[PDB]
Amino acid sequence: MEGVDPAVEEAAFVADDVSNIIKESIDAVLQNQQYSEAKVSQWTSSCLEHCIKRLTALNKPFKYVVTCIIMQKNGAGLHTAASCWWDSTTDGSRTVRWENKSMYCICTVFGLAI
Amino acid sequence: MEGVDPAVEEAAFVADDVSNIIKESIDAVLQNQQYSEAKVSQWTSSCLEHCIKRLTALNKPFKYVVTCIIMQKNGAGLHTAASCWWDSTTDGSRTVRWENKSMYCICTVFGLAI
Numbered sequence: 473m474e475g476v477d478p479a480v481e482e483a484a485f486v487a488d489d490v491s492n493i494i495k496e497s498i499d500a501v502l503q504n505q506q507y508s509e510a511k512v513s514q515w516t517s518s519c520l521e522h523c524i525k526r527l528t529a530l531n532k533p534f535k536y537v538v539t540c541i542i543m544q545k546n547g548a549g550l551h552t553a554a555s556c557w558w559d560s561t562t563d564g565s566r567t568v569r570w571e572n573k574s575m576y577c578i579c580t581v582f583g584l585a586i
Numbered sequence: 587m588e589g590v591d592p593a594v595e596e597a598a599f600v601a602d603d604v605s606n607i608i609k610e611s612i613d614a615v616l617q618n619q620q621y622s623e624a625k626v627s628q629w630t631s632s633c634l635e636h637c638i639k640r641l642t643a644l645n646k647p648f649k650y651v652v653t654c655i656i657m658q659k660n661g662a663g664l665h666t667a668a669s670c671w672w673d674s675t676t677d678g679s680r681t682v683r684w685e686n687k688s689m690y691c692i693c694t695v696f697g698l699a700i
Binding site: 512513516517519520521523524527528534535536537538539540541542543544545547548549550551552553554555556557558559562579580582584 | 626627630631633634635637638641642648649650651652653654655656657658659661662663664665666667668669670671672673676693694696698
């Protein structure tokens, strides 16, 4: 009763504004062409440019970061770590996990308040 | 003519001040105890706290971020992506890759100029 695994297991709860841009971008940055390993990483890189470029067009918020991590297969181990200093202004961090069949792609948009 | 693989293949070229703190921290955050899978990720998390806490003691620079990614084994696939908005003040990004025998641990310190 599955067949396909499309955004079946999304992560975090990003705002509507950023959630749509980032996701719509993956939809295009990943569906634009066929599954290419050379693109398996470049994909998300283009999304980052297609996420940042869009956020600038919308200009809201102002200061925002766009990072993502590619999860090759399911058996592969992936773990990131990050401890930031003090900065209430630059606080957002909204991660999302995209999935299709097996390969997973996580992308987090950091909505920093100026 | 190898035997061991300790920081054999370091990444980037972080400043002396941050390079020592971060590395000295891994040395402790990873050598403090025995190799534990439960700690394989918590390790770098403690380093992040032992990196951030130190940077505060040194208070230089001021605004700094501390993130890291764990590379389980060598066959496992790991890829991160991040596109940030405009901000010349918050620009540093210095990554380092630690290695011992097989498991790799990357940690990047973001030295932001206030």
